[PDB]
């Protein structure tokens, strides 16, 4: 079993993959919990942030592969899908940010693509090696992962299933940062806090539904365009538009409302 | 307020946000001018490249946070785009000689360019959420096309300020150097464009590379279109000067088509 | 009057594609485009060739169209429609066309010493073979317009920080590791593995599916790969701690 943990302070939810056993080894249920954990903590108006990361030493060691050899394509229903985290972080109207604090192998990594943001273990090993046992990428990795790389390094990396380090993560856009393993959640958190105190909550959902909402759906310039427009006056018809500049000019913390 | 400056010389057109008591300051009307520019010097025959820059120290510094109160104090044509046509709507290349800070819109208007040349010494940021509004000017567009989403959510998100030298490894500038040097190394790639690149070419281009991503063009749409492009570009004059002069080691005279 | 050839040797199931025209710098013609159109469907088709390394006659990889004093995709079906990677060991010199060939493929390994460019405007035509479309899908929009629109040299290690090339070497090492790469893929990842994962990346992009099309394209050739031998196989050598052995391998 890997279990899911939670805790909620001042804004910033923090989840934990702990399964120390099996280094927080993905398993079914684990994504049922994950995706029901998005879908409550995006729905829930104090959650700003949310924070993924694993039990040390580990982020998440992908499947089970031991227990892997006979999972044939069984009829039944619902039936089988790639993408076992439904709604995926990207859907979500709040930030995500993935702590890598450690290994993160196939569905651990692919997993870790959903987040907006990733913050690398440089000690870590990092793979998508699914090709490399007969099954494929999973989780949306084919199409998250040319977003962040382009077509050769995600080819490359989907392909033959070659380990990669934090360092050539951040070299080629996969993550925003790499770390000493200790220092990765402090990091993350820290962000977090900066995103809950310091940017306004409809500015932030708004700005990561048209990012994400245009990627997904195939938006044209006019169209994103037209987006940014509308939501410029929904945001300017709120107060926190005015209350913004008024707290930075004062030199106090933002009291934002919201909408 | 924070004026256009405007010079042509040798098919290179100059513009510069020149406003030295505010960082170069954005305004609305300002954008009205900028937009109005780029039409009419992409219209202009001789005009073979644009580029953008600010007054000394810097590029520009986005609308400013001292502004806001009388803003949402006081249009049924407000547009989160206020600069229209788009550098990446013209035919002419645009190179942004970004000198110096380049915050809020300064840094979205900057990322409409075909080439960004950043100051190390700048500040860098697109901080709008960080006031209650939002990234504007196709940032949510432009800036995942430069950089991925994942530098693209962490600046759009957390508003967060980066250095020139970031923005080269990232993909979002071709080129950081000191601010005094920026202008003219944005100088001499624009007027290499002007003496060695085909105007027509250059063109086609521009455009077939913009149109696509604008419009989500399928593969099989570019290269329709390339083949079209090509079949045009062929049965003129510039397509054969480009090789002679080349095998003559002379600078080529363009006609353009 | 002797041309640009096309060399192709298959060995353990790595065929190598060699443009092998040392008294041109390995030119390219219609008709060189025509023959590798060719050769990349018959080994797209062949069983046994697991991965494709296209490639140059030293010193240099393809210096481009011949310059004096129809389809601008002259190799059809190209590289990123196969079922089978393929990877470009750009050994040398690739220059407009040749490096735009070079962009159609999986995986680049570029000489350190190379000269790259995409010249064709500074000729008076323009980029070719989908340049406008690979190439901001592999470096973004900014250095895609600065290659295109100036058509100016750039290098090997400029494109391995960019995104366009996943490795650079000293010009001599380049076949070996492309070969080493491709070998490893002949050996420890599954046929269709490869191929689905190949179609389903590329197919996306050609095509810009929405990501729930591709989710639902990841479910449906999951169902496909887990009602084949090969998955039961990549656990099964793992977990003996052998070698695995594709089917009809
Ligand atoms: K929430
Ligand atoms: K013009
Ligand atoms: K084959
Ligand atoms: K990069």
Redesign the interface.
């Given at each position: 079993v890997t279990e899911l943990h939670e805790e909620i302070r001042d804004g910033v939810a923090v989840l934990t993959l702990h399964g120390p056993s099996t280094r927080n080894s993905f398993t079914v249920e684990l994504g049922r919990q994950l995706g029901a954990a998005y879908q409550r903590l995006d729905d829930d108006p104090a959650v700003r942030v949310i924070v993924l990361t694993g039990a040390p030493p580990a982020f998440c060691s992908g499947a089970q592969?031991?227990a892997?050899?006979?999972?044939?394509?069984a009829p039944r229903n619902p039936?089988?899908?790639?993408?076992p985290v439904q709604p995926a972080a990207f859907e979500l109207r709040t930030?995500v940010i993935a702590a890598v604090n450690g290994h993160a192998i196939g569905i651990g990594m692919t997993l870790a693509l959903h987040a907006?943001?990733?913050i690398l273990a440089e000690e870590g090993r990092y793979a998508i090696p699914?090709?490399?046992?007969?099954?494929?990428?999973?989780?949306?990795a084919?199409?998250?992962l040319?977003?962040?790389?382009?077509?050769?390094?995600?080819?490359?990396l989907?392909?033959?299933?070659a380990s990669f380090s934090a360092q050539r993560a951040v070299?080629?856009?996969?993550?925003?940062r790499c770390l000493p393993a200790g220092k990765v959640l402090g990091a993350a958190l820290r962000?977090a806090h900066?995103?809950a105190t310091?940017?306004?909550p409809?500015?932030?959902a708004?700005?990561?539904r048209?990012?994400?909402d245009?990627?997904?759906?195939?938006?044209?310039?006019?169209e994103?365009?037209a987006?940014?427009?509308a939501?410029?006056?929904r945001?300017?018809g709120?107060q926190?538009?005015?209350?913004?500049?008024?707290a930075?000019?004062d030199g106090r913390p933002?009291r934002?409302a919201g909408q």
């Open positions: 592969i031991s892997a050899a006979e999972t044939f394509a039936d089988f899908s790639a993408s930030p907006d943001i990733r699914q090709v490399r046992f007969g099954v494929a990428p999973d989780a949306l084919h199409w998250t040319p977003r962040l790389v382009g077509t050769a390094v995600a080819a490359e989907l392909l033959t299933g070299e080629t856009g996969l993550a925003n962000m900066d995103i310091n940017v306004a409809e500015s932030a708004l700005t990561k048209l990012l994400w245009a990627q997904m759906t195939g938006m044209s310039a006019a994103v365009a987006r940014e427009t939501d410029h006056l945001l300017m709120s926190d538009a005015a209350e913004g500049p008024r930075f000019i933002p934002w």
